[PDB]
Ligand binder design. Structure first.
Ligand SMILES: Cc1cc2nc3c(=O)[nH]c(=O)nc-3n(C[C@H](O)[C@H](O)[C@H](O)COP(=O)(O)OP(=O)(O)OC[C@H]3O[C@@H](n4cnc5c(N)ncnc54)[C@H](O)[C@@H]3O)c2cc1C
Ligand SMILES: Cc1cc2nc3c(=O)[nH]c(=O)nc-3n(C[C@H](O)[C@H](O)[C@H](O)COP(=O)(O)OP(=O)(O)OC[C@H]3O[C@@H](n4cnc5c(N)ncnc54)[C@H](O)[C@@H]3O)c2cc1C
Lengths: 259, 253
């Protein structure tokens, strides 16, 4: 599974904060259509939180927690939902889905996207080559999760930039789907250490090749992270300042102790 | 300039056909929203084929008021004449067989336009090239299908950002040049991704013919995935387009 490091536990806590803030909104859903959309996302978010923790999605326990948050008092004040959330969560033995910190920043959102990426890379590396059925389904859920990233926070240019470029991320998830599918039909995945080797092996005329960068999604999501911060200087019409430092792959791997 | 080749000629005609079929839906629009968007797309589309900006402005205002009641072969006839009335024979498609290939050809044609504009940029008119890049993203964000394939549109709307991301790379590259560092053009995608793996803004590497490579790769991806979409293994005669081959077909250097 995934290396335990300080950053990864910030990711894990940020991710539960993001989930908690998305079920909070359930209360306020004036829209039938918005309620169902949030129900599915909250379902899926806690599915992947329980999966890594209990080794089981707990479909009927999280199903309870959703009913609750939709049928919750839609006239709370911040903590007026938090309090009973802890009260609800523990009656379902889901306390390990309670966030420790509640300060919701842009890094809550980044941490959550990086978190899901590490889950995809882990699910793929620890795949049993029989229930490819399982992993391939989760990848589909992951695309659905990255497609509907709620900001909760209000930043309209962030929201419109992402809708324009998020397909960069979803594209690489689908690369993995092609890789798992090629393995189901007898061509094992050849894991490679560089994104550039995966680029080189994609440029073939036949379908018989199957290379995939190890920790693809950690690399994709970080490159994407750099890209958003690269581009914000254009939206702001400034030269990138000297204080601006970009994440390099080798340093990112070091911080999360990836091999 | 873009090399004149058989494939490139087919691209330009497919592009006119796509633009023709786009304005054919102006007369059918029952929405102020959709008329504005269709007209934006059209203005951009013909702008990138041409300036005759007033002859086009009224080719479109003609397309808005054309008879809703016509069949397609009639609108064509009326369009084939308003174009000649307008000194715009160059916008007339030669074929009208509209297929998935017409859409792909249109996406590849816009890609060659991006690469050409960037490579023949002028270090003083970067403000112009960067405003063109913003128009392109709108064209790519808004790919109408005309023909109906709901999974095609659902899929495109999920991964179209792969293409738009790479347009935004070029913008980033041009901004590092407005501020002092000239673009270096590299011959492989690998080098460009290696040059972006730096902590400090010292590099400005761009793949030459990047958007052609990007649009080719993305085209292969769509076809790669259609076999998964059909619980199937791809036929033995399926052949992915390779980069060396694609440059050979368009005489790219
Ligand atoms: C989907 C999304 C879209 C956004 N779109 C825009 C936009 O369009 N315009 C705009 O101005 N802002 C946008 N933002 C916010 C922007 O990215 C930054 O969050 C903010 O502008 C600056 O915050 P910061 O200086 O703390 O850097 P941050 O990137 O927020 O730092 C947060 C954490 O991430 C670490 N980190 C930095 N880079 C990486 C990396 N490549 N990979 C992994 N970790 C990294 C940092 O060291 C730190 O731990 C977006 C954010 C998200 C999540
Ligand atoms: C945006 C878009 C999205 C689509 N999404 C789907 C989908 O989700 N599911 C589905 O089943 N179909 C989808 N299609 C249609 C699909 O891509 C094929 O076009 C279709 O299946 C017809 O098969 P074909 O072999 O005749 O087309 P193609 O093989 O794609 O024919 C296009 C022409 O251009 C050439 N060409 C082929 N590949 C490339 C390449 N990688 N780069 C440059 N040139 C190339 C070929 O020589 C051919 O002449 C999509 C099409 C478009 C334009």
């Amino acid at each position: 599974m995934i290396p335990l490091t300080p950053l990864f536990s910030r990711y894990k806590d940020s991710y539960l904060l993001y989930s908690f803030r998305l079920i909070d909104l359930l209360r306020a859903s004036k829209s039938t259509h918005l309620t169902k959309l949030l129900s599915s996302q909250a379902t899926y978010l806690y599915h992947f939180a329980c999966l890594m923790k209990y080794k089981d999605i707990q479909k009927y326990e999280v199903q309870q927690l959703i009913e609750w948050a939709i049928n919750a008092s839609p006239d709370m004040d911040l903590q007026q939902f938090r309090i009973e959330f802890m009260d609800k969560t523990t009656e379902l033995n889901l306390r390990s889905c309670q966030p420790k910190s509640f300060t919701y920043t842009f890094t809550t959102i980044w941490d959550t996207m990086h978190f899901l990426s590490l889950i995809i890379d882990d699910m793929v590396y620890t795949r049993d080559k029989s229930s490819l059925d399982f992993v391939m389904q989760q990848l589909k859920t992951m695309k659905v999760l990255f497609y509907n990233v709620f900001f909760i926070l209000q930043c309209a240019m962030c929201r419109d930039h992402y809708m324009n470029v998020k397909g960069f991320i979803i594209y690489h998830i689908e690369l993995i789907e092609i890789a798992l599918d090629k393995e189901k039909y007898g061509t094992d995945i050849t894991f490679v250490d560089s994104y550039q080797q995966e680029t080189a092996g994609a440029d073939v005329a036949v379908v018989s090749n199957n290379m995939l960068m190890k920790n693809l999604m950690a690399y994709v999501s970080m490159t994407f992270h750099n890209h958003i911060n690269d581009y914000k200087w254009i939206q702001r019409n400034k030269k990138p300042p000297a204080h601006y430092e970009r994440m390099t792959w080798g340093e990112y791997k070091k911080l999360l102790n990836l091999q």
